[PDB]
Design an enzyme around this catalytic site. Structure first.
Site, PDB file in Angstrom:
ATOM      1  N   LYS A  31       2.802  23.493  37.874  1.00 28.91           N
ATOM      2  CA  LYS A  31       1.984  24.389  36.885  1.00 28.91           C
ATOM      3  C   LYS A  31       0.361  24.788  37.299  1.00 28.91           C
ATOM      4  O   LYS A  31       0.003  25.416  37.084  1.00 28.91           O
ATOM      5  CB  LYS A  31       1.956  23.780  35.539  1.00 28.91           C
ATOM      6  CG  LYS A  31       3.543  23.696  35.142  1.00 28.91           C
ATOM      7  CD  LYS A  31       4.223  24.735  34.960  1.00 28.91           C
ATOM      8  CE  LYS A  31       5.389  24.834  33.810  1.00 28.91           C
ATOM      9  NZ  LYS A  31       6.194  26.092  33.523  1.00 28.91           N
ATOM     10  N   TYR A  47       5.780  18.312  37.959  1.00 32.72           N
ATOM     11  CA  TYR A  47       5.572  19.353  37.085  1.00 32.72           C
ATOM     12  C   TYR A  47       4.401  19.847  37.203  1.00 32.72           C
ATOM     13  O   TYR A  47       3.968  21.119  36.962  1.00 32.72           O
ATOM     14  CB  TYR A  47       6.331  19.135  35.875  1.00 32.72           C
ATOM     15  CG  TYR A  47       6.329  20.264  34.855  1.00 32.72           C
ATOM     16  CD1 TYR A  47       7.096  20.994  34.332  1.00 32.72           C
ATOM     17  CD2 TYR A  47       5.117  19.981  33.823  1.00 32.72           C
ATOM     18  CE1 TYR A  47       7.054  21.829  33.384  1.00 32.72           C
ATOM     19  CE2 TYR A  47       4.819  20.917  32.853  1.00 32.72           C
ATOM     20  CZ  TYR A  47       5.987  21.914  32.515  1.00 32.72           C
ATOM     21  OH  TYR A  47       5.993  22.788  31.522  1.00 32.72           O
TER      22      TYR A  47
END
Ligand code: NA
Lengths: 254, 251
Positions: A148, A144
């Protein structure tokens, strides 16, 4: 003489619903996009007849999405879809790594490509990506986080290539926000939220509304000279470490 | 029930005047601080009886300024004073280096210390520092740039230490800004500069003021320690080099 049209992805989630409500309050027609048809329909019912229209799409096919949007002229994209899978590299598999990259980085690419032609044709567009402080600092959830971080890069690539077309692209980076994404952790450690306050200089977390307020600003003419920016909405988390500062200075910071 | 009070430094300059006008438009009582008394007098006259009060001060003495503000309760500081001296290290002297540090970094420290105790006592304050893209990337004006990098550090130090007191601190970083002086300089002949900017245009003073207003507002109540560029995309990368590296047009 017609409302500005804003596409908001992940619309049925915690931050997504706050985004939809804030942009509706600002007078927009909102296209609320989510993969969860039943959750999205329920939220639309709860909105009580606002200028909102649901789009059920999983953000894996840009051309499919563009065709679904053929009767719309999207002025603003708030790219908010994407949740974390594995919490540590220990817990990460090749499959969950790739899945987090697809859900958190490529889903945003797909969202942009479905609306970017019209923005460029009208010389008017704002792409506001909901990122994460995890994309800037190592805090867990590693695939993740890598996705990002990639979103910050992507926003800057969008900014330099399409600014000549009047399209802006920016990233809002929330810290801890109370959403259903925390339900499992709260059930495991019900004091997780109070234990986390020490890390935040403002001694409180951003709310979904706080994130939506920053997204509204960056999507507005009040930010018409802002593009390629990363704006943390994080209670001060990325500024430093006041818990370590207290130990280093022997003075009270929190 | 009473107006929020906002102290704005460098108030008579191009960006400062836009800041004063934008915060007045938002309903604030504005304390317009500048070293130039005649410039302040002209500006106050031009504002036409708004909720503005001039403060003539050179930001070298925090106690002197705090005492001048003894009958005010400053809720917001927009720290905007500070200009660049030397354009290159070649042109820089130890004296001009120290002068740029004092005018662009310590002047902001002085401005904050003049209002911070009252903000803490009331558990309410927003500090919004006008920095520069030069504080983030090397673009010339080196002592100014080092000072502006220090301002980003100072905002983060303020954020972590005083967030517990309900005080926020953030930095707005403009690139080239179309001030009236800039327009007058451009009118003398500068279009070579637009290639650097993705938006193919420069920020206006009001663009900077809009960002300062946002960061100083409750719509940014969870934002502290942040650096917000208002630069038409300048800091995102280099679209002129990208054109040469990709062999495709970017502008
Ligand atoms: Na500092």
């Amino acid at each position: 003489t017609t409302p500005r049209t804003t596409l908001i992805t992940g619309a049925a989630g915690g931050i997504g619903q706050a985004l939809v409500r804030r942009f509706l309050a600002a007078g927009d027609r909102v296209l609320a996009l989510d993969r969860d048809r039943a959750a999205l329909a329920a939220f639309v019912d709860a909105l009580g007849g606002a200028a909102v229209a649901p789009v059920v799409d999983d953000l894996t096919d840009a051309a499919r999405l563009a065709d679904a949007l053929a009767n719309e002229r999207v002025d603003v994209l708030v790219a908010n879809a994407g949740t974390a899978a594995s919490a540590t590299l220990r817990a990460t598999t090749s499959a969950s790594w790739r899945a987090d990259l697809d859900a958190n980085l490529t889903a945003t690419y797909v969202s942009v490509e479905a609306v970017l032609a019209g923005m460029r044709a009208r010389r008017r567009g704002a792409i506001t990506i909901v990122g994460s402080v995890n994309g800037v600092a190592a805090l867990g959830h590693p695939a993740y986080s890598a996705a990002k971080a990639g979103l910050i890069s992507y926003a800057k690539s969008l900014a330099i290539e399409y600014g000549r077309d009047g399209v802006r692209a920016n990233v809002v980076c929330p810290g801890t926000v109370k959403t259903p994404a925390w339900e499992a952790r709260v059930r495991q450690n019900p004091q997780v939220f109070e234990q986390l306050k020490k890390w935040y200089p403002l001694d409180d977390f951003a709310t979904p509304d706080d994130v939506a307020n920053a997204a509204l600003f960056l999507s507005s003419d009040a930010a018409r000279a802002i593009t390629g920016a990363m704006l943390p909405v994080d209670g001060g988390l990325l500024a430093g470490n006041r818990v370590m500062a207290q130990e280093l200075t022997l003075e009270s910071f929190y």
